[PDB]
Design an enzyme around this catalytic site. Structure first.
Site, PDB file in Angstrom:
ATOM      1  N   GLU A 247     -44.376   5.084 -37.631  1.00  0.00           N
ATOM      2  CA  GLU A 247     -44.405   3.661 -38.015  1.00  0.00           C
ATOM      3  C   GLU A 247     -44.234   3.481 -39.533  1.00  0.00           C
ATOM      4  OE1 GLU A 247     -48.011   2.720 -35.964  1.00  0.00           O
ATOM      5  OE2 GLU A 247     -47.024   1.496 -34.433  1.00  0.00           O
TER       6      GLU A 247
ATOM      7  N   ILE B 101     -53.519  -0.165 -24.191  1.00  0.00           N
ATOM      8  CA  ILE B 101     -53.527  -1.013 -23.081  1.00  0.00           C
ATOM      9  C   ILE B 101     -52.450  -0.603 -22.115  1.00  0.00           C
ATOM     10  CG2 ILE B 101     -53.728  -3.387 -22.242  1.00  0.00           C
ATOM     11  CD1 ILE B 101     -56.095  -2.460 -23.963  1.00  0.00           C
TER      12      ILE B 101
ATOM     13  N   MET C 117     -53.927  -1.722 -32.105  1.00  0.00           N
ATOM     14  CA  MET C 117     -55.173  -1.068 -32.420  1.00  0.00           C
ATOM     15  C   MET C 117     -55.683  -1.062 -33.886  1.00  0.00           C
ATOM     16  SD  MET C 117     -54.452   2.070 -29.819  1.00  0.00           S
ATOM     17  CE  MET C 117     -55.980   2.936 -30.202  1.00  0.00           C
ATOM     18  N   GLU C 118     -54.968  -1.734 -34.784  1.00  0.00           N
ATOM     19  CA  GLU C 118     -55.379  -1.719 -36.172  1.00  0.00           C
ATOM     20  C   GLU C 118     -55.407  -3.044 -36.980  1.00  0.00           C
ATOM     21  OE1 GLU C 118     -53.664   2.016 -34.777  1.00  0.00           O
ATOM     22  OE2 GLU C 118     -52.401   0.360 -35.361  1.00  0.00           O
TER      23      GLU C 118
ATOM     24  N   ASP D 270     -43.655  -2.064 -25.767  1.00  0.00           N
ATOM     25  CA  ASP D 270     -44.014  -2.067 -24.359  1.00  0.00           C
ATOM     26  C   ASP D 270     -44.709  -3.391 -24.086  1.00  0.00           C
ATOM     27  OD1 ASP D 270     -47.267  -1.674 -24.421  1.00  0.00           O
ATOM     28  OD2 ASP D 270     -46.330  -0.379 -26.028  1.00  0.00           O
TER      29      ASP D 270
HETATM   30  N1  LIG Z   1     -49.981  -1.060 -25.252  1.00  0.00           N
HETATM   31  C1  LIG Z   1     -50.560  -0.878 -26.503  1.00  0.00           C
HETATM   32  N2  LIG Z   1     -51.902  -0.932 -26.625  1.00  0.00           N
HETATM   33  C2  LIG Z   1     -52.461  -0.695 -27.872  1.00  0.00           C
HETATM   34  N3  LIG Z   1     -51.704  -0.482 -28.973  1.00  0.00           N
HETATM   35  C3  LIG Z   1     -50.351  -0.470 -28.885  1.00  0.00           C
HETATM   36  C4  LIG Z   1     -49.380  -0.250 -29.878  1.00  0.00           C
HETATM   37  C5  LIG Z   1     -49.464  -0.055 -31.435  1.00  0.00           C
HETATM   38  N4  LIG Z   1     -50.029   1.262 -31.737  1.00  0.00           N
HETATM   39  C6  LIG Z   1     -49.241   2.516 -31.530  1.00  0.00           C
HETATM   40  C7  LIG Z   1     -50.428   3.519 -31.230  1.00  0.00           C
HETATM   41  C8  LIG Z   1     -50.613   3.722 -29.700  1.00  0.00           C
HETATM   42  S1  LIG Z   1     -51.886   4.969 -29.362  1.00  0.00           S
HETATM   43  C9  LIG Z   1     -51.098   6.436 -29.764  1.00  0.00           C
HETATM   44  C10 LIG Z   1     -50.379   7.256 -28.884  1.00  0.00           C
HETATM   45  C11 LIG Z   1     -49.758   8.416 -29.367  1.00  0.00           C
HETATM   46  C12 LIG Z   1     -49.979   8.860 -30.676  1.00  0.00           C
HETATM   47 CL1  LIG Z   1     -49.285  10.429 -31.271  1.00  0.00          CL
HETATM   48  C13 LIG Z   1     -50.749   8.132 -31.580  1.00  0.00           C
HETATM   49  C14 LIG Z   1     -51.265   6.883 -31.124  1.00  0.00           C
HETATM   50  C15 LIG Z   1     -51.625   2.913 -31.942  1.00  0.00           C
HETATM   51  O1  LIG Z   1     -51.525   3.122 -33.390  1.00  0.00           O
HETATM   52  C16 LIG Z   1     -51.486   1.376 -31.806  1.00  0.00           C
HETATM   53  C17 LIG Z   1     -48.145  -0.304 -29.145  1.00  0.00           C
HETATM   54  N5  LIG Z   1     -48.380  -0.546 -27.787  1.00  0.00           N
HETATM   55  C18 LIG Z   1     -49.755  -0.659 -27.623  1.00  0.00           C
END
Ligand SMILES: Nc1ncnc2c(CN3C[C@H](CSc4ccc(Cl)cc4)[C@@H](O)C3)c[nH]c12
Ligand SMILES: Nc1ncnc2c(CN3C[C@H](CSc4ccc(Cl)cc4)[C@@H](O)C3)c[nH]c12
EC number: 3.2.2.9
Lengths: 234, 232
Positions: free
Chosen positions: B12, B152, B173-174, B197
């Site tokens: 990101e 989620i 999440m932030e 998504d």
């Molecule tokens: N359905 C969802 N729900 C929560 N957060 C997000 C996000 C935004 N973020 C990307 C990321 C998803 S969790 C994840 C998984 C793999 C790894 Cl290596 C590192 C983190 C979080 O920083 C929040 C996108 N879709 C989301």
């Protein structure tokens, strides 16, 4: 004679007793937080009032570490008791801290683990031993073990059931400890949580907390005061 | 003017990081901050790591070490509003925690004691972001973005968000952690993320497939918004 002990409590009532006892006290106001510096029975301390929940604790702990550079961190305050032998006023000491409300299990992290972190944060063995020595000397009832944190006040129902299911070994629940542990982990600073029971996190926990928050603050503060003296001198 | 930019995952922040000239790296508390210029505008780009505490620790380091005038939160998001497709932009008008609950003491659901029930994003930053969206011909929604410490993935987690925040346009999440830290320091913020998504039962697969598309769209928006703010 060159140790500085950092202490963190979330609510003002959770820090006010220690705050009283600080000699040569001065107040640092920053980022919505307060840190009280001076000495507690001779030992240099920096006491942070963080405010409530994971982000407030994280912001506070980060300012305390950057501005005060304490050698260790002790998290004081109340908690919801989960272990069956706990009664209001009893002590809980962290072995380890985990978030009960983190869930990235869709990508196969362990329940409670955030990506980039260990699944739980281990409290420091020496701090834990020193706390247990204080519990013996004070003749208190205590349980040592996992404490879980989240951004919810547990009040029975699903919230409690979910924690008992995901973390059957959790001894107590609260809202800041893990975030403090996570900040300390990132800065390599040893921590321990020494809280006291204000309620048992069930459907009456709000009324028990209304009644017993002061008793828990008093018991946890007494323990922290003893711990600081033990760490400083033995 | 110094613009602070925060993204959580390395993916990101990487595109922006590649564009920062006169670039220096500060490595502190498990975070990295890249300082320098983005198309001639002074920026400080934080890679915070994942979730509310990581974001809060990193935002606090960035405000303390770099003293940016404003904060823009970049990255991906789960889309909740019906007109959103993968790659589309969401702009916060406000941020709330979806997973904070001190309702036992009569705080509003999502509110932590000592905070407003939600954190309002900066009106001038929002207007600038909407001018960029129109100039780039993007599809975007402005509205409430909700944060928690969960990815989620449909089922009861999604249902609960929709019950509590029927107006939420996206989840992540932030952002709300960043908003809260900004609140405590009186720093204006805005969230400009893009959809990877729709936070449903296949959100993990969609994220596997489209994280990079969302990181790209949100980064390109951020780059345009930086330029607009600094240079009109
Ligand atoms: N359905 C969802 N729900 C929560 N957060 C997000 C996000 C935004 N973020 C990307 C990321 C998803 S969790 C994840 C998984 C793999 C790894 Cl290596 C590192 C983190 C979080 O920083 C929040 C996108 N879709 C989301
Ligand atoms: N059942 C429980 N669940 C979560 N945390 C706790 C705690 C420990 N904290 C006290 C406090 C309860 S929430 C609240 C209520 C009103 C006001 Cl003015 C300020 C805060 C949080 O800092 C965590 C004790 N029992 C708890």
């Amino acid at each position: 004679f060159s140790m500085k002990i950092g202490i963190i409590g979330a609510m003002e009532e959770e820090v006010t007793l220690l705050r009283d006892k600080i000699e040569n006290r001065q107040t640092i106001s920053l980022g919505g937080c307060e840190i009280y510096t001076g000495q507690l029975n001779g030992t240099e301390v920096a006491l942070l009032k963080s405010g409530i929940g994971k982000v407030a604790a994280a912001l506070g702990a980060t300012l305390l570490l950057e501005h005060c550079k304490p050698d260790v961190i002790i998290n004081t305050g109340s908690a919801g008791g989960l272990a069956p032998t706990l009664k209001v006023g009893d002590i809980v000491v962290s072995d380890e801290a985990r978030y009960h409300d983190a869930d990235v299990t869709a990508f196969g992290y362990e329940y409670g683990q955030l990506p980039g972190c260990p699944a739980g944060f281990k409290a420091d063995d020496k701090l834990i031993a020193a706390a247990e020595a204080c519990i013996a000397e004070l003749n208190l009832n205590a349980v040592r073990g996992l404490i879980v944190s989240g951004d919810a006040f547990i009040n029975g129902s699903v919230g409690l059931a979910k924690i008992r299911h995901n973390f059957p070994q959790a001894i107590a629940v609260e809202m800041e400890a893990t975030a403090i542990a996570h900040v300390c982990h990132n800065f390599n600073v040893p921590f321990v949580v020494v809280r006291a029971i204000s309620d048992v996190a069930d459907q009456q926990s709000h009324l028990s907390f209304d009644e017993f928050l002061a008793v828990a603050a008093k018991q946890s503060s007494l323990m922290v005061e003893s711990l600081v003296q033990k760490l400083a001198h033995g």
